[PDB]
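Re: your question about Thaumatin I

S., sorry for the slow reply, the queue was backed up all week. Below is exactly what I fed in.
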Amino acid sequence: ATFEIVNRCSYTVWAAASKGDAALDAGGRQLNSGESWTINVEPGTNGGKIWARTDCYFDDSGSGICKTGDCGGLLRCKRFGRPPTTLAEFSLNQYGKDYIDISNIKGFNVPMDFSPTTRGCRGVRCAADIVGQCPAKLKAPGGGCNDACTVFQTSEYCCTTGKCGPTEYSRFFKRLCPDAFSYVLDKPTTVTCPGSSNYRVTFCPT
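Result:
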């Protein structure tokens, strides 16, 4: 499957793509404002994620640090990134269907649209000013708005027991972005697409 990753933000981002235990395609790349990066994701990929990283510095070897979404200091991510990260999530070719969603379960750093470029389903978007409106206790110094599990590490926020409800913090994310997951047991906003669809992820779509 083909994913076109487009940076419409006025600032540079370092896109990342991983399935948790391996990179997808090159795993990461700098995107200046307006740039597009096309990656190929193997059919059958389960649990892939794409995210943006902000305020990164990398040396020649591709090692460094980012203020949001850092994946162990690497430009080419092999593992998932440190919150806060708005997440585009996907599982492809699962019994004939693709499943896509946007998630704020690991916080929010950059607004995002995640849409198919082929026919048969709708896209999803979280483009509100979550960082500007972020509750004081969730604000991350490097930038972004953390989720409550990252900040407080309780069974309720992290849904450790498999039973948890919405919270004051999850409801904040849900009010600004209804079509994104706001906590682990949120009513799913996953979109079902035909298997082998292609997609575009746009940072700062508005």
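The two ends are 25 Å apart (CA to CA). Residues 168-176 form the longest helix (9 residues).

Happy to talk it through on Thursday.
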